[PDB]
């Protein structure tokens, strides 16, 4: 129901914050080729619990930090 | 090496017309039969004979008319390096509709004029004229 997204957990080093990159898969406006395009986001996790290199599921929230307005909701396939 | 069996198929059809062969064979695929069961229905081949157990082999029968060929043109629209997805309104008219355009939509494989009457677009495979 909620406008939620997934993506790739890139960084988990800084506290209560993870970096998640998102693949948007879009047509070129002229050449028509479908391009994998990457949108990274600073996502507020709690607990610093996310393993690096992971698929998370996120949600747009009120502005948490100077570079961070995103909070996860849940985690799929945490392992390596 | 093997980047497409479909572009392999159409070229083997294309080179067999000029070679004036009566039977063009190749290993078969599930998508290959779904195309080969159109052109018999659309009247561009005469027979296809899918056989083979360990590995299915599709064997075709080329349609020739007045000595010369029937397949005047055979192309590829959605190549593996560049895919084509057109809606029901942007379905083409091959040789002003006299030829046919093979489109695969969610309702299997059919021609464009059937897909217009189906009222739903999809992935245009090739042009046959």
């Amino acid at each position: 129901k909620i406008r939620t997204l997934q993506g790739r957990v890139v960084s988990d080093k800084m506290e209560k914050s993870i970096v998640v990159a998102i693949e948007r898969f879009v047509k070129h406006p002229i050449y028509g080729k479908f391009i994998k395009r990457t949108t990274k986001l600073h996502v507020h996790d709690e607990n610093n619990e996310c393993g690096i290199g992971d698929v998370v599921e996120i949600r747009e929230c009120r502005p948490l930090s100077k570079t961070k307005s995103w909070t996860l909701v849940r985690v799929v396939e945490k392992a390596v | 090496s093997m980047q497409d069996p479909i572009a392999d198929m159409l070229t083997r059809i294309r080179n067999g017309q000029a070679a004036n062969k009566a039977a063009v064979t190749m290993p078969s695929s599930k998508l290959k039969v779904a195309i080969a069961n159109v052109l018999k229905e659309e009247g561009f081949i005469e027979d296809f004979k899918v056989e083979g157990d360990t590995k299915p082999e599709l064997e075709l029968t080329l349609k020739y008319f007045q000595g010369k060929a029937v397949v005047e043109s055979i192309q590829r629209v959605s190549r593996p390096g560049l895919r084509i997805y057109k809606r029901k309104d942007e379905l083409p008219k091959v040789m002003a509709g006299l030829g046919i355009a093979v489109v695969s939509t969610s309702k299997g494989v059919m021609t464009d004029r059937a897909a217009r009457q189906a009222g739903l677009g999809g992935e245009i495979i090739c042009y046959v004229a």
Binding site: - | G43, F65, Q66, V70, M95, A96, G97, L98, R113
Partner: protein, 156 residues
């Protein structure tokens, strides 16, 4: 009734020990207003003389073209010797849209409402050879019904 149009007046030369022998060459096309058309490239020592040889070539060796009512039946392209030329049927009451030799060859072909475009070499000898080849293999709905073993309504 076979209306005739000259296309090119031209002066080529051979070279001998004495000097240069100028020779005048000419390209013509004939056509009946139906789907019968034929081109002719003549050559002599004289401008009103080489055209008659150009006509006499064109009066023979004709070609039978499946027209529609006043236009083509489907767009098609035409090539001969680097002279890629695209052509296209049009709606009624728009005239011939072409240039060079292509205006002449379609007018004796008896079409009336076309779209046409030349790419590459506009050499009037090979540009009209490309028009003919595209008009030659343009085929009827009736033939492809017979070629595919169907009817017109089984094609539409």
């Amino acid at each position: 009734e076979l209306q005739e149009k000259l296309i090119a007046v031209n002066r080529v030369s051979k070279t001998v020990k004495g000097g240069r022998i100028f020779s005048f060459t000419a390209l013509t096309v004939v056509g009946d207003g139906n789907g019968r058309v034929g081109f002719g490239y003549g050559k002599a020592r004289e401008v009103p003389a080489a055209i008659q040889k150009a006509m006499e070539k064109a009066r023979r060796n004709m070609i039978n073209v499946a027209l529609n009512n006043g236009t083509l039946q489907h767009p098609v392209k035409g090539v001969h010797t680097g002279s890629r030329v695209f052509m296209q049927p049009a709606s009624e009451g728009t005239g011939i849209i072409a240039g060079g030799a292509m205006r002449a060859v379609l007018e004796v072909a008896g079409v009336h409402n076309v779209l046409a475009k030349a790419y590459g070499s506009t050499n009037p000898i090979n540009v009209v050879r490309a028009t003919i080849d595209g008009l030659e293999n343009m085929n009827s709905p009736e033939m492809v019904a017979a070629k595919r073993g169907k009817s017109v309504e089984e094609i539409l």
